Amino acid sequence: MLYILNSAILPLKPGEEYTVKAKEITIQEAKELVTKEQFTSAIGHQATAELLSSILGVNVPMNRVQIKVTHGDRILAFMLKQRLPEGVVVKTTEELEKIGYELWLFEIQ
Amino acid sequence: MLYILNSAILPLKPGEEYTVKAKEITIQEAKELVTKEQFTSAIGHQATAELLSSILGVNVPMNRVQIKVTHGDRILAFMLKQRLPEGVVVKTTEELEKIGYELWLFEIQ
């Protein structure tokens, strides 16, 4: 399964060791992923869900579910380019864009 | 460099692709790491810093710095066993322990 997350987090299933390949991808590559592959959104932030949905032209909903990734899964991670203090919640898509972000693809095995 | 982080995050330096090995480690293994290796704490949460410092018997300070990890770096990640809503900041070490946590070691190349 491909999971869409809004930090470069690896919520790995315990009991195993993993090798994870990681690279940055473009919005266009992300669009290809979410248009051609099954995916589950685990985005926990509404403005990020809205930004991604707008820039990818796909419905990427906020879905505050706990997930565990295992062998064969992939993660498309939205990662802000600056670290924010804990508790700080960005309110607008414009702020996310001005802070800047990267999309990373992690492939788990 | 070994970095100590309080989520299973991979703040990877852009411009490269990575292979990352990941496994869960024990508190004792973590103690060995932070006692025998150079390390930089990037823990952004005081109660987590205090919990880790207490259970490892080493000074792991809160240090809200932006970091970027690259080839040859390692990350010791504190990861809570349940996902909390964004903005929610745990106030006590007792709550962290009752939610439960895992320590993961990521080795980047």
Q: Which two tokens stand for residue B40?
A: 């930089």
In which region does residue B85 sit, left (phi positive, over 0), alpha (psi from -120 to 50) or beta (all else)?
beta
In which region does residue A6 sit, left (phi positive, over 0), alpha (psi from -120 to 50) or beta (all else)?
alpha
Entry field: residues in chain A? 109
A44 touches chain B (CB under 8 A): yes
Cβ-proximal residues to B31 (8 Å cutoff; 6+ apart), any chain? B56, B57, B58
Q: Which two tokens stand for residue A68?
A: 């565990």
DSSP state at residue A85:
P
Environment class of residue B69 by beta-carbon count within 10 Å: exposed (0-12), middle (13-18) or buried (19+)?
buried
Question: Is-contact B39 B105, C-beta < 8 A?
Answer: no
Question: Is-contact B9 B43, C-beta < 8 A?
Answer: no
A83 touches chain B (CB under 8 A): yes
Question: Is-contact A18 B77, C-beta < 8 A?
Answer: no
Three-class secondary structure of residue A43 per DSSP: strand
Q: Which two tokens stand for residue B44?
A: 């952004």
Q: Which of B14, B82, B106 shows the shortest C-beta gap to A24?
A: B14
Bridging pattern class, strands B39-41 and B74-80: unpaired
B24 sits in which H/E element: strand B18-25
In the chain, the amino acid numbered B92 is T
| Residue in A2, A53, A47 with CA at minimum distance from that of residue A31 | A53
| Residue in B13, B10, B77 with CA at minimum distance from that of residue B43 | B77
Domains of chain A: 1-109 (3.40.50.11170)
In the chain, the amino acid numbered B46 is Q
Resolution (A): 1.3
Q: Which of A66, A79, A86 shows the shortest C-beta gap to B89?
A: A86
Technique used to solve these coordinates: X-ray
Angle between helices A46-56 and A27-36 (to 10 degrees): 90
Task: Match 């930004």 to its residue by tokens.
Answer: A51
What is the C-alpha separation between A10 and A106, in angstroms, rounded? Answer: 8
DSSP state at residue A57:
T
Q: Which of A8, A23, A44 shows the shortest C-beta gap to B17?
A: A23
Q: How far apart are the first and last CA of chain B?
A: 12
Cβ distance of A87 and B87 shorter than 8 Å: yes
